């Protein structure tokens, strides 16, 4: 896998690939690596698929219970912390999970990285998975706070494409999300095969590849 | 986790038109030492079931006691213990299969391979296998250990599929089993000449044969074999 997420002027972008592998065999061409915890909360998935699904769906239970008890949406900071504390219970037991908790709350847009070790980091931009290095390359050179929603969605899309191309264990399709103060907005499933040829022609990139 | 110490080799079995046949030799091996020569590895449960066991003998004796206790427990507050509510082969097998899988799940297995042969209330033949891993399967022929490699091929020439069962008589089936036991004696280094055989028929009931021997053996051709290549004398 490759996942990314970044904050900007108009909220936070979330982009992931959809490939799943069992060794060198591609077990799945299209797997959902985002989880919708609530209308204002998202969660990315990298590592063991089972661990990612179980614990983040269990987080949504606990985030939902928070709303019922307090009559108010949980913060991104609190949600990420609950998850990191779950990881800390099964400390050294062999869980493999790398996720970004993305959302909008009272403090504005929020983005936290959380992994199996219990690490919990706040930041503007993150990328996880085997192809994160390729994604960071495009993100770091093109990112601004002053990005438009249209350009930002493209950046996250183009960054995954870069990784899907080079990384053998990343590909399939791109799932886009945009988080606003009115909630998250799904911006579709984009096949990499078709997207690659399109970007090549329109952008002029990937000159070394023949098509 | 353990290792098997005193062991029993192949148990072989097959279905025929009116019932099932099961057989196993009377040896208890201690590694390469043929230590114990009077070991019964076919254990009847009532008059409708025979459980054949291979592998660790100490675990076999444990299982033997569980089955003996199962019969006792089934008779408690049961006026139909010798009739409608008697123990069935399927009940006995599923009990053992439950025990075997639980024990492997605690990483403390019963180091055995078991075949439960019998006839049900409705006359249907029952033949199912279970082992130390809790793995279960059924087939017209079943065999454990070396029997799986050498006996099944011979027994499957008689009953290759389900439709061959009604065409197979008890005489033919017994003949095939007895021939298979001879082949195992030729080729299995951990086998013995003495064996036990059991037939469970839906009409004639349970026939248990002890102190059987492998006979009609071919050895004469050995006299002509000389050296390992070039030697003539």
């Amino acid at each position: 896998t490759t996942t990314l997420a970044f904050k900007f002027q108009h909220g936070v972008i979330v982009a992931v690939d959809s490939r799943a592998t069992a060794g060198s065999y591609i077990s799945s061409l299209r797997m959902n690596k985002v989880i919708e915890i609530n209308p204002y909360l998202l969660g990315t998935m990298s590592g063991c698929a089972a661990d990612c699904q179980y614990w983040e769906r269990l987080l949504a239970k606990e985030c939902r219970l928070y709303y019922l008890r307090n009559g108010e949406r949980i913060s991104v900071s609190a949600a990420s912390k609950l998850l990191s504390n779950m990881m800390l219970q099964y400390r050294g037991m062999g869980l493999s999970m790398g996720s970004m908790i993305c959302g909008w709350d009272k403090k504005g847009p929020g983005l936290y990285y959380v992994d199996d070790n219990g690490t919990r980091l706040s930041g503007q931009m993150f990328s996880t998975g085997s192809g994160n290095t390729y994604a960071y390359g495009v993100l770091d050179s093109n990112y601004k706070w002053d990005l438009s929603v249209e350009d930002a969605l493209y950046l996250g899309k183009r960054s995954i494409l870069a990784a899907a191309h080079r990384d053998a264990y990343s590909g399939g399709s791109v799932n886009l999300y945009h988080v606003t103060e009115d909630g998250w907005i799904y911006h579709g499933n984009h096949d990499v095969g078709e997207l690659f040829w399109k970007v090549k022609e329109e952008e002029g990139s990937f000159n070394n590849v023949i098509g | 986790t353990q290792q098997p110490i005193v062991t029993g080799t192949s148990v072989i079995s097959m279905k025929y038109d009116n019932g099932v046949i099961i057989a196993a030799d009377n040896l208890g091996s201690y590694g390469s030492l043929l230590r114990f020569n009077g070991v019964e590895r076919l254990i009847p449960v009532g008059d409708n079931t025979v459980v054949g066991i291979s592998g660790d003998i100490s675990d076999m004796q444990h299982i033997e006691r569980l089955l003996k206790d199962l019969v006792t427990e089934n008779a408690y507050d049961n006026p139909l213990a010798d009739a409608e509510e008697a123990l069935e082969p399927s009940y006995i097998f599923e009990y053992l299969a439950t025990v075997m899988y639980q024990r492997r799940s605690k990483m403390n297995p019963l180091w055995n391979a078991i075949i439960v042969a019998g006839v049900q209330s409705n006359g249907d033949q029952f033949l199912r296998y279970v082992n130390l891993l809790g793995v279960t399967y059924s087939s017209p022929t079943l065999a454990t250990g070396f029997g799986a490699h050498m006996a099944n091929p011979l027994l499957r020439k008689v009953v290759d599929r389900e439709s061959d069962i009604p065409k197979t008589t008890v005489q033919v089936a017994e003949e095939a089993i007895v021939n298979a036991m001879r082949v195992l004696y030729y080729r299995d280094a951990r086998s013995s000449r003495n064996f036990s055989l059991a037939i469970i028929d839906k009409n004639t009931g349970l026939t248990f044969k002890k102190n059987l021997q492998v006979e009609n053996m071919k050895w004469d051709f050995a006299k002509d074999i000389k050296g390992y290549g070039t030697q003539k004398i």
Binding site: T21, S24, I26, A164, F196, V209, G211 | -
Partner: protein
């Protein structure tokens, strides 16, 4: 670590009616990293075609070696080598390194210039010949190629039909293998004309 799957790649060959086809992907990688999308794995010595999968250094090395040997064969014999003869040469050359082998999966394809009979063959890394009538597969997606070839293949296909069958077998096998893809090439071979086609495929 496994030399036969560091660089990745696949090769497949098929027989048709008075023709043969051989195809390969263009990927070369360092495990997860894709390095080249122009690494062709099929070579030809006269009218005999050889596809090689596995460790890239050995692929390159063996090409240069069989070029060496076939050029000498031709100077002495005063004729081009035939597929049946070349197949034995490959087997001989691989087995001479029995206890220090080239980590490869070669595939021979060609038409005997005298009899006109289509010919394909495959080898393990140590020289064992697989002379199949229908098809030969090799590479990191060999399991995938076996499934495709076994279901899609039918005997006595015409060149332009054989092209479609072999191309679809390769493409769809490569799309279920992380270490294969990044382009593809198909050779359609007839007794006295050979066409080479680069396929369009997903670049991930």
């Amino acid at each position: 670590s496994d030399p036969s799957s560091i660089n990745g790649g696949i090769v497949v060959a098929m027989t048709g009616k008075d023709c043969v086809a051989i195809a390969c992907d263009l990927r070369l990688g360092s495990q997860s990293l894709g390095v080249s999308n122009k690494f062709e794995k099929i070579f030809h010595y006269g009218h005999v075609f050889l596809g090689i999968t596995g460790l890239a250094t050995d692929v390159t090395t063996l090409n240069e070696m069989f070029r060496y040997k076939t050029n000498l064969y031709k100077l002495k014999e005063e004729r081009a080598i035939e597929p049946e003869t070349f197949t034995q040469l490959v087997s001989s050359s691989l087995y001479e390194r029995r206890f220090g082998p080239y980590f490869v999966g070669p595939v021979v394809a060609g038409i005997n210039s005298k009899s006109g009979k289509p010919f394909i063959a495959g080898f393990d890394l140590i020289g064992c010949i697989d002379e199949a009538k229908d098809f030969i597969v090799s590479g990191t997606a060999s399991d995938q190629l076996f499934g495709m070839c076994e279901s899609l293949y039918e005997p006595n296909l015409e060149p332009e039909d054989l092209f479609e069958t072999i191309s679809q077998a390769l493409l769809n096998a490569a799309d279920r293998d992380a270490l294969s893809g990044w382009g593809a090439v198909v050779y359609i071979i007839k007794k006295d004309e050979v066409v080479k086609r680069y396929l369009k495929m997903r670049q991930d």
